[PDB]
Amino acid sequence: DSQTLVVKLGTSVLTGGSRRLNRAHIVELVRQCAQLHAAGHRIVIVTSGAIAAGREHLGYPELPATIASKQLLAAVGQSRLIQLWEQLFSIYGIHVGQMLLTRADMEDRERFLNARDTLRALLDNNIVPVINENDAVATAEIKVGDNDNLSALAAILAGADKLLLLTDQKGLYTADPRSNPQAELIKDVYGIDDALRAIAGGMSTKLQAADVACRAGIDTIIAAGSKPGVIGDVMEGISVGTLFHAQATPLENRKRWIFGAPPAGEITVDEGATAAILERGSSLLPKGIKSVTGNFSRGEVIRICNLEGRDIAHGVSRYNSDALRRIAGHHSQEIDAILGYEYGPVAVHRDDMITR
Amino acid sequence: DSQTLVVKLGTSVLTGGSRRLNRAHIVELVRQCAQLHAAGHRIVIVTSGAIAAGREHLGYPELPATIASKQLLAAVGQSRLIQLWEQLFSIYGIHVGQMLLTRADMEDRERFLNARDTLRALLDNNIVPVINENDAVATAEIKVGDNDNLSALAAILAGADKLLLLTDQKGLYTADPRSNPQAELIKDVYGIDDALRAIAGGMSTKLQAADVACRAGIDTIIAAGSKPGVIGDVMEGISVGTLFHAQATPLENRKRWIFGAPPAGEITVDEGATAAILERGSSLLPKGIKSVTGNFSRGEVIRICNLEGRDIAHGVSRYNSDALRRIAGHHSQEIDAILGYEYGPVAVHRDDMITR
Amino acid sequence: DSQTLVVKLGTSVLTGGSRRLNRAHIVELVRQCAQLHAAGHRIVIVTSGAIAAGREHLGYPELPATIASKQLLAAVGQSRLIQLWEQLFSIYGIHVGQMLLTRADMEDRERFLNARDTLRALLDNNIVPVINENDAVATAEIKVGDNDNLSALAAILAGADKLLLLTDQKGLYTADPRSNPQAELIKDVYGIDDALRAIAGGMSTKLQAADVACRAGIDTIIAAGSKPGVIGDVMEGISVGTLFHAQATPLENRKRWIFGAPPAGEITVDEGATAAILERGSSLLPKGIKSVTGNFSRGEVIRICNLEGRDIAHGVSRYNSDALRRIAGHHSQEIDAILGYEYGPVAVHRDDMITR
Amino acid sequence: DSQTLVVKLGTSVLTGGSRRLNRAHIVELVRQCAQLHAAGHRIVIVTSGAIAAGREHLGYPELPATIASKQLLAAVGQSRLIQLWEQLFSIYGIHVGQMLLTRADMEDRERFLNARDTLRALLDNNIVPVINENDAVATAEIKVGDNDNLSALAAILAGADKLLLLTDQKGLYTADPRSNPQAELIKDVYGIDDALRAIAGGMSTKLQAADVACRAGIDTIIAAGSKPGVIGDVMEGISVGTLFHAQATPLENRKRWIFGAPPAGEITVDEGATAAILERGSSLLPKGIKSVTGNFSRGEVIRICNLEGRDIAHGVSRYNSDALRRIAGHHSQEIDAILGYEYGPVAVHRDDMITR
Amino acid sequence: DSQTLVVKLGTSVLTGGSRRLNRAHIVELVRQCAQLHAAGHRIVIVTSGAIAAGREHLGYPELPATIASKQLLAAVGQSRLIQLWEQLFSIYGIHVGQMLLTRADMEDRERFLNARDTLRALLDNNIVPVINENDAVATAEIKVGDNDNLSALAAILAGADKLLLLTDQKGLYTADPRSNPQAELIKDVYGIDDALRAIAGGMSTKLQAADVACRAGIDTIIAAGSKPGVIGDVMEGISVGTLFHAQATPLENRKRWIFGAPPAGEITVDEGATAAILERGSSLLPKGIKSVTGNFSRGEVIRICNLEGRDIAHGVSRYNSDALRRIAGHHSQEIDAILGYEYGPVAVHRDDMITR
Ligand code: PRO
Ligand code: PRO
Ligand code: PRO
Ligand code: PRO
Ligand code: PRO
């Protein structure tokens, strides 16, 4: 059925090795993405090339060879890059959204929940998210990587099924193709070991991204951007590059997410909502909450118990402690009236909750 | 001579109170800003209206009344808003750079230094920075404020001389103008008092922003965006609204910045660089550094001591501890060869240093 | 038993804060009102949203930001708003009548009596009156208030027992709920004081309306429109928001109405009608009138004296001086033949008369 | 060129003598009106039949034979009447606005200005105003007249060129057509004499309306509603009924309007605006006003002088005294900033001024 | 995840036993359906009550007691019924489509495919299909059943997961509830036995519909329309009436559909498309077709073999034999050029194929 694919396109794929973005290759890839999008799939694009767009837009000026010059070029050219993406996608009647994320945002619980919420909102409305790194405050991908770890983090955030990394090479080779005439492309890989890290070598960052994505239960595909119909075959299942299989299930990833750290808060729930959670496996509404203990923000993991005090679930909170205390015992429609804002009608969602 | 002005435009000023952005008012304001820019002044723009631009771009769809819907609209419309700013400013031959900042970024030392570096790079290249909140990860300004506190933070980050906030009203009135025919506009304010807070009230967020900016040594002017030539009059010195005077000097703000927290590390400096720092008050080059103690990141405040151990200065570090250790004792031209990147030829700048 | 409730719905409640009217919320409120109506209660609705309905009907055109544009939108959308109310109420088999009133109409005695007669005729025929401001001639509520004072005037005109105002917030808080976690909702209020005005602040117009209604002997409840079953709970007596108790009895309000101004005229009454007025306290028929002095219109307060000249009552006149002179001494069944119209068989009603 | 026609349709024309509104005749008349509207003319419709619509909608119930029953029927059926008008006009792609006016509103200066403003706004946007009497507060037209004087007042308010009254008779006859075989239809009338009032006689109210309209400089045409193409021929100039010629010019009417009463206020104007008013005959902007004397509301006649004190003009004021004092000496764009609302950029319009 | 529910509402549920449709009950049920629709489910409504709407619209005339009178009433009132459904659903911002189906249409292969195509198109675009019987040509449901078998056929056509029949009774009872105090509602039923038909008895048609639906692999729920939240509980899984479990899987139903009759035609397929069909299970494009044998229409079952003549699949054809012959061997984008119309890019869909 419907699937989620995260396509990562580097600077070499977008420019083709030249000093300018090659719009013909990008329009071919956009055509493939639109073909997939029309069939009901969800597409997330992690892009680079803001520095190239800024350099072209400014007339290729002479700047100091420092990080600040790259930050300036990225700041000037992020607008041009997103404008190009929107213009190319509007040919096929598709809208494009812009998200600027950093690793620190992914590490923060509240920021992670906010980013996941806006990404889900974009995906539910048939809008393609285009994701880059915020180069104003973070300079990690400028120095090394070129949005490689950002792609893995975006795949984890989007709940993707596949992560396709497009590069200039065809994939992973057992030996050097030039030196060894018998060197062959590796078809499937089950776990990254020291031998693969040694044979791989520019390909180290992609290997780290693949390891991170596969440890979270996402299948990674390293392929060549110039191969015709690469995105469509990746979605269908045809082998086009190197395939790294998921080393875990999504349930294991959710277990690690919930139980990685001790709960930040403690909430008590009446009998009816306890029965709804246990027997029916449904979400937790603010009506059933009786007491709120602890000082925690939105997105933190809290412990849900019954009136007797027995732990019954662990789940992430969609509201911080103060809002939960203020809206406890009320109906959903009143939440906005109580707070002036609304995150949704549930306090703890069922997909973010693990029953103990 | 040349000064720095930060102009804050809310959604009410941009849309004129209507459904969509009014480009005539924005083009008049851009004309005034370009007139100031051509005279050698530096202009920073803090703006809103990404949600309105996104709603107009998407055809005004029907969406749930949640925060995620506003995040989606902001993501879709940030590109359109920056496109509008770029197109309006290019009429006068001015380039525009986009920066997305949050309060957490300003609080963090490393992110603050990165953002200040990119803003300075933009300003020294005759590029107008356009600053908005990163709505994907932060929702503080969506709920309340409309980029009011962000304006003060950007004024502090840019080292601005004036912070002008454009609103619907003409300024601050002692009494209600409708009820009291004798009510008059307050011209000058020296400090924020409880009586001023009570009589202010929509203006509470502007009052907080003015207090924050004035405590940092920046004059804050609340004026009406519809006043003809308001920006030029503000920059020249003509009374146009309510003016809040700085309650501190920039030197006091630098002292509070440096000495607010204990130093994160310590670095020893040879006799030549000690004489340069003390007698001449110059920046600290990496060649003179002899040792590095502790683990600190870029942007943290460290203690500069001499060979005898007598503390001589306190200053923020342009490199983290590891890079400082690697490039200690080397010439500046080799920095990029040693690290793979360069932040500049100085380890601690003279304007970031306080001599003890 | 049967009671009169006046429900005031603002534009925020009707549209949900969005661009267009939200018919689901209005249908829920109409369901509650119909449930009350079927039980024998009388319901009066004061509404807004003519401008929003007109803007939606016209295709959201681009208009000058003047008062005349809002007047045009209200003129276009009043018909659509009344159509929506009629269609929603006819689901439950209830008819809807439209009344357009201004403050000047309420101030005038004759127009007040005409409007009260219309409202009473509507209420005795199981027809729900829907009251809005006549935006063609009056602009007071367009600028500020949103039919808040008009709600109090309609409650006074209808002889209502309760005036419920639906807003976005839950009611009145002693402290700011966001800033102070210990802030709590005020349940009951006995009189409007300066402390209440200071802590209230958007709610100032509601405070003025509550003061006006309570000075006339009507209990005013400020509640949230999104609260489930708020109308039924209000009518039963359950606390749902902030309650302001009546500071006068309806008898005191009638005394203030009758004796606020000097009588406009004097009429002499024979012995039989004098005995009916004094001993039995019945209405004054035109047959008993012997003379009419002065020139007054319908709805003015006049002095009823006996043949000996001793003043015996003060009451409002259902006919002007000329009609009273023409129909004096005649039977009530022939009023229409003499005048060409009939206001009823009584000259002064017993509930509009105070016996001296 | 373009003209303004006010069509008055009574209950007999709309119903055809039956108990229900005849939609075929109304659709024919609407077709003629739409033909005129498409050619660039401005059409204003003064209508009746709210009581008939209310009677039909309620199932023809049994009600007391009083004025309050007629007010109830009008309140219920005004919505139905305006809905019918809108539905019939939307066949030809024309929108319809609703205005409820009374004679007291026309007699009041501020209410007259508000009504004229909303009518002009409706006419400028290609919207047909449909005008009836507010039967909730006024009962004059219910008793006698059937919107006859209201039509003359609406023609005066709209600045119409022609007022066409449609009835069942063909016009005015010299003698009784049935008794006298030589009785002929009067083609033209120049002033109403006692002989005309005697020969006319149900036709007295139409004669009063024609006299009122022609005394204000508007040509009146009394014709039969069933005559094919009566509206088009009236606009073209073909004789179809009785024609009453204007007894005055519009300039005389404006002179009477300005100088009917002593000025309510006094304003002083600087030299530049004085020169603009005198030699150029332009409107008066708030920038040129120096002082404001007196307490007057919007729509009142005030005296405009120069700094020397010599009277230079008399004109109606678009703002009341307090607003004029608050916006005196400012620019137009700031008006909305100062007052919170705007009536337009001119304090006194050029078409409302008489130069002394 | 997302599910498909077919709700069947009889005349008794819509009218409540009276002579008119009860819009309050229908609006409650529509509110529940809209709540389900907003959550991503697909809702199909099989309705009755066209005769009641026609009787009400015509004023309840006197007609002969024949079938033709019922056909007349249904023809007049189908428009009114669909208008009522659309008006009630537009409160929640949902569109409604109208389909008139008969049993003969379901028995015909081409008509079945056309109806399934339009139903799928309506469901994919978030439009609620409202289904009734075409009473102009078919009179089966008029005589007996009241859209009971039509509901089962619509559930089979829509590929629904649940079929909920709403009636006035609470469900199926073991004995007569009034005669036997111990009579209890049957909770679950696994297959219809002669004992069930004997105990059931007006409930025979519902039993036949449940048997037909469950033999095709659809769970049936017989419940009471007046029970609050019956639709939501049915979707969730809460027991609210009598539950008839599916006696077969959807795969068995597809096997019966394909292999019920001998194939109507024969088509040969090249090697590439044969490989795509066999080991990948993909749809059959017109490019791979080599030869077409037989005379069959669209929707018939045909046999797909390879060039060697070995049978490889059986599937229903989306094009008739002539169109398939004309578009054989071409690309998909030129189907419209060749034929002048298009049914889609696949000759045989993958979900309609059984691989031999
Ligand atoms: O967009 C760019 O070009 C830089 C490099 C990767 C992250 N930001
Ligand atoms: O751009 C906007 O509209 C929102 C509000 C301020 C920050 N982001
Ligand atoms: O109906 C409206 O929208 C305006 C505001 C209140 C009075 N008229
Ligand atoms: O509309 C009607 O029928 C009444 C009579 C004229 C004025 N109002
Ligand atoms: O709609 C109706 O009322 C008839 C009876 C069921 C099928 N058609």
XYZ file of C-alpha atoms in Angstrom, chain B residues 27 46 56 66-68 102 120 124 182 198 236 272:
13
model
C 6.889 48.804 -0.880
C 12.309 41.337 11.678
C -3.017 32.868 0.467
C -4.624 23.511 16.043
C -1.039 24.707 16.342
C 0.098 22.207 13.697
C 14.468 30.949 18.025
C 27.723 40.272 10.555
C 29.366 43.819 5.852
C -7.061 65.635 27.036
C -0.682 49.577 34.077
C 17.580 61.108 12.054
C 54.555 39.048 23.605
